[PDB]
Structure formats: structure tokens, C-alpha cells
């Protein structure tokens, strides 16, 4: 549903040239970024500060700054202490869930080389059984320092629920906004003989849930193949739904788009014109 | 061996219309590791000043990147996206689909 999580990417291409990224996300929308130049939290939106005070944000900066330096620099010896093979990548994500209203439902996971490696379960780092012994060896390291785990537990149990509560409220105007879609038709890669591919693009709509279907009058053409919902530079989404029919039965077909922003006035485009032609 | 290969999708923000500015998007997703080096191409040559989104990964730990640029189409212009991953024996080019 609605989840606020903070991601962490650590890429190690060789013994030199290590990469590090930290980002915050409202489950599809990036809201925070970490500036390694000055060790500060960059706010992508004015409402991304939530209901947290300015002083409260400074302590979060020092927490993330100190955590990052100690964590991201201690990897380098571990790759040599262990048998890590460059290149390797460490990914971490942690946050909390908006169940029904909000609150309970926090999480924190770590992945080595793109596979589930370890996870933090309410006071302790539990390895994934399929991850093998190396996860257990690094769970031993992570579970040693109690003070860090107490901070981590408080971060997932108190700060996250209290932050997403104010973050959603302060960002209500941006999230509840409705943007009408824009649609057009085109020709597709043209499958085997006697068959045409009809493409119906839908672009620039927010929120995400959309309805698109090729129609012949009121009859929905169930051969409609709906693709992936792709993003854009703005918070809008793009989607094209295709349909393959015989050449002689192309006319009378129409693409129909339903969206909450349209207020029930569906977009209908007809396969007529230079398309037929 | 457990490295994943990217999914490349190219699309325009608005219908193609010569002389009218538009946005070309190339969505590179579902790949691992991060070193990816995607290029947007106009008539074969590379396009400079191409913006892209911050790196992120989906739930299955595979990364996704969005590369976009502003452009104005013409009749003779061709556009494509060039991706070069470790899982590619040669760069994979996905062409923008016009009529």
C-alpha cells in the first residue's frame, strides 16, 4: 500500500572506485537524497520535511553521516578479510508500512550481490536460511554492538511511524492531486501475414491506477495486451495497450481510457483516418 | 552468474509531431550489477546533455534507471537507446517507434 523506506546502495567495482548512494522513497516517489559533498539530507520537495523540527533533522543527518562512514568504510577490509570478489554490491532498505491507517509494519533488509542476505527482526539480525554461513558470519558482527541495534530498533519503531504520519499529511496536496491522461494511437511491429498490431498509448496521468482497453462498440476486445506502467521525469505515468487483429477486420475498433481524473468522461479514440487508411 | 540483464523500454511523452518539442524516455530496469552506461541516440550519433533519474532498485533487488531528454522530431530523424551491460555481448539498441 503506502510505505516509506530508505534505500542504500554500495557498489564496489574494484579495490578503488567505490560508489555509495542513499535515497528516500514514498513507495514510488523519491523524497530525499544524500549529499556526500557536505553530508546533508537534500529535500526534493518542500513538504518532504514532514512535521519534524529543524533540530530533529540535524540529529538524523549526524546519525546517517556517522552510520554511513563507519559502515561504508568497514566493508573494504571485509572484502579482503572474507573472499569477496569484485565487483560486488550491498543493498539495504528499511522503513515502515501504512497498514489500514498507518504505523505498525516496519522492516529492514540487506542484500549481498542482489540476493536476500540478512534482515533485522525487532532486536536482532536474522540471516536468511538460503543465504548460507556468510550471512551468519555477518549477523554475528551486526548483532554484537547493542547500542547500534537499540538505535536501529528505535529508528524503525518510533521515528519511522512518527515521520510517515506527518509526511503523508504534509504531502496531502501533492499525493491527492489528479492529472488527466493524454492518449494517441499508432501502428505496431506488425506480426505475421494478414495481421495488424494496434497500439494505444496513454501518457501523463496521475495517480497510477488506470483503465485501458481496445473496444468494438461496447464489446471489450479481450485480445488487448496491456504493457508495463513506465515513469516519466515528472510524477506522471505512461502506458501503451496493444491489440492484434486480422487486416480485414480493423475498422469499428476504438481505445477507451478510464481514469479518476477524467471524472467519468472516458477518452475514446477511433482507428480512423490515415491509420486505416 | 547471478547477474541480471536489463529491460529496455523507449517511449515519448507526447504524440510525434514534427516541429513540436517532445520528451524521449528510455527506461532501463531489472538489471544487476549497477554499471550500466545507457546512451540516447539521434540518427545514430550520441545525444549530449541527457538527464537521468537517481539509481534505485525494485523489490527483487534489481536496479532501474530512467533516461530522458527534450527533443523536437523531424521527418528524417531517428531515435534509439543504446545500453551496454556486462550481460551483453554487444550494445543493445531499442528504437523509438513512430508511424
Amino acid at each position, epitope marked *: 500500500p503506502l510505505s516509506f523506506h530508505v534505500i542504500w546502495i554500495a557498489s564496489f567495482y*574494484n579495490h578503488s572506485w567505490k560508489q555509495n548512494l542513499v535515497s528516500g522513497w514514498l513507495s514510488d516517489l523519491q523524497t530525499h537524497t544524500w549529499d556526500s559533498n557536505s553530508s546533508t539530507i537534500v529535500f526534493l520537495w518542500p513538504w518532504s520535511r514532514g512535521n519534524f523540527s529543524n533540530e530533529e533533522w540535524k540529529e538524523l543527518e549526524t546519525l546517517f553521516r556517522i552510520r554511513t562512514i563507519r559502515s561504508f568504510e568497514g566493508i573494504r577490509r571485509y572484502a*579482503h578479510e572474507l573472499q569477496f570478489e569484485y565487483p560486488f554490491e550491498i543493498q539495504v532498505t528499511g522503513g515502515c508500512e501504512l497498514h489500514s491507517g498507518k504505523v505498525s509494519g516496519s522492516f529492514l533488509q540487506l542484500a549481498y550481490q542482489g540476493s536476500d542476505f540478512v534482515s533485522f527482526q525487532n532486536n536482532s539480525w536474522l540471516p536468511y536460511p538460503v543465504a548460507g554461513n556468510m550471512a551468519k558470519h555477518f549477523c554475528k558482527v551486526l548483532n554484537q554492538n547493542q547500542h547500534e541495534n537499540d538505535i536501529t530498533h528505535n529508528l524503525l519503531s518510533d521515528t519511522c511511524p512518527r515521520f510517515i504520519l506527518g509526511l503523508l499529511d504534509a504531502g496531502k496536496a501533492h499525493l491527492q492531486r489528479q492529472v488527466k491522461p493524454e492518449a494517441w494511437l499508432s501502428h505496431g511491429p506488425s506480426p505475421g501475414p494478414g495481421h495488424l498490431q494496434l497500439v494505444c498509448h496513454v501518457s501523463g496521468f496521475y495517480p497510477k491506477p488506470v483503465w485501458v482497453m481496445w473496444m468494438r462498440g461496447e464489446q471489450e476486445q479481450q485480445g488487448t495486451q496491456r504493457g508495463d506502467i513506465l515513469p516519466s521525469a515528472d510524477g506522471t505515468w505512461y502506458l501503451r495497450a496493444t491489440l492484434e487483429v486480422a487486416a480485414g477486420e480493423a475498422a469499428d475498433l476504438s481505445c477507451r481510457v478510464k481514469h479518476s481524473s477524467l471524472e467519468g468522461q472516458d477518452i475514446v479514440l477511433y482507428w480512423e483516418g490515415s491509420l486505416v487508411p | 552468474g547471478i547477474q541480471r540483464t536489463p529491460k529496455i523500454q523507449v517511449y515519448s511523452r507526447h504524440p510525434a509531431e514534427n516541429g513540436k518539442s517532445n520528451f524521449l524516455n528510455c527506461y532501463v530496469s531489472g538489471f544487476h550489477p549497477s554499471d550500466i552506461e545507457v546512451d540516447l541516440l539521434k540518427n545514430g550519433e550520441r545525444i549530449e546533455k541527457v538527464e537521468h533519474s537517481d539509481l534505485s532498485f525494485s523489490k527483487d533487488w534489481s536496479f532501474y534507471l530512467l533516461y530522458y531528454t527534450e527533443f523536437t522530431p523531424t521527418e528524417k530523424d531517428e531515435y534509439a537507446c543504446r545500453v551496454n551491460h*556486462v550481460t551483453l555481448s554487444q550494445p543493445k539498441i531499442v528504437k523509438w517507434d513512430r508511424d
Partner: T-cell receptor
Amino acid sequence: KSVIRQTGSSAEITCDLAEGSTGYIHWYLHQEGKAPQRLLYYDSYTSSVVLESGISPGKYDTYGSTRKNLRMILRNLIENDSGVYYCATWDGDYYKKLFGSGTTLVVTE
Amino acid sequence: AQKVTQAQSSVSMPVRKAVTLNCLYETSWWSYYIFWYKQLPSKEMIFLIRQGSDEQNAKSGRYSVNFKKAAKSVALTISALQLEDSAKYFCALGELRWPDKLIFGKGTRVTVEP
């Protein structure tokens, strides 16, 4: 330029590399009939040593001012440590990596 | 991961002629460089020429290369052989995007017949 040591002693070679350059200075080992291979590099921005894949953490160490007086100490020498040791750093443009003067190490029982 | 090999070790060719030193590499990188270094008998390494992953055949002075990228074969050809050029020549490759180290070949000694 040439150093002689007995098995078990120590040897501190010097790096006479041209002026200051990019932060990382790598140490390579060249032996007769074998391909040169880097052993480690020195991070001047952190004044710390990072090793390569399969080197014991006590054998090599690096320190000093990287401007023409970077040192590299080898301890607990064995016979197979003999060879020419170079120090290398990349250009500012990363076009080529400069190599300093070699230092021949001879270890005998 | 990466391997660089030079098959032969000793090569001789008369002065005022041309000889070619070959180099074979096995890499898994789409962006890399190829370097040739001249090792003097005084134990000193000197850069000679650089060849890029998607660069045309490099050329500088009396140096030229024959880049067969399909089979991963780069050969250094030294034209107008002089007497000072007699040394031991090495080929190595490094990461173009993240330059860390060089994987060297085992060497190819060239002596010039006067």
C-alpha cells in the same frame, strides 16, 4: 637502487616517483619470466593501506609523504620476495599510469 | 576474469626494419584500454601507446597497432627499427571507467641486429 637482505629480515624501499600526482600510488612486483602484478596501493587521502586478493595482512606496509619519498616496508622476507619493485600512480587524466624507478630486491638464505 | 598473454619471449630483427609483437587478452569488460610499456634493462617502465575499446588503430611516432577486437588480438608493430628501441616490451589492460590496476603479459624481449 639495489638491496640485499637475508631470509627473515626487513627491507624498506623508497618510491622516487615524479612529484605529486593522483592520490593512489600502487606497488607492483616484477620477477624474471613472470608478469608484473600489483601487490597493494596507498590511499594518501586516508593514509591507509589496502591490499590485493591473497596477501597476508602483515607482509607489506606503506607510509610517508607521497611527493617523491613514499616508503614501502617488507617484513619477514622469504626467498620468493626477490624481484624488481615499482611504484605506480595514474595520471590526472587517467590516460596512462606513471611508473617510478625500479628497485631490485635480492633475498638469500 | 582478466588474462593477458604474450606467447613468445625472445625476438631479434635487424636495424632499419620492422618487427611485430603480439598480444592476446581475455576480458569481460565493454570499456577498457590496452597499454604497451617498454621495460629498459635498467629496470624502468616507460609508457608507449594506448588503445581504446572502441578506438581505431592507435598510432604515434614509430608505433602502430593492429586491433582485431573480434578475436581480442592487439599487435604492436614498431617500424623503422632503431638500436635504442631494443628492450623488453609488455602489454597490459585496465578498466576504462574505473582505472585500478594493470594485468600484464609475461614479456617479449626484442634485440636489434646491427
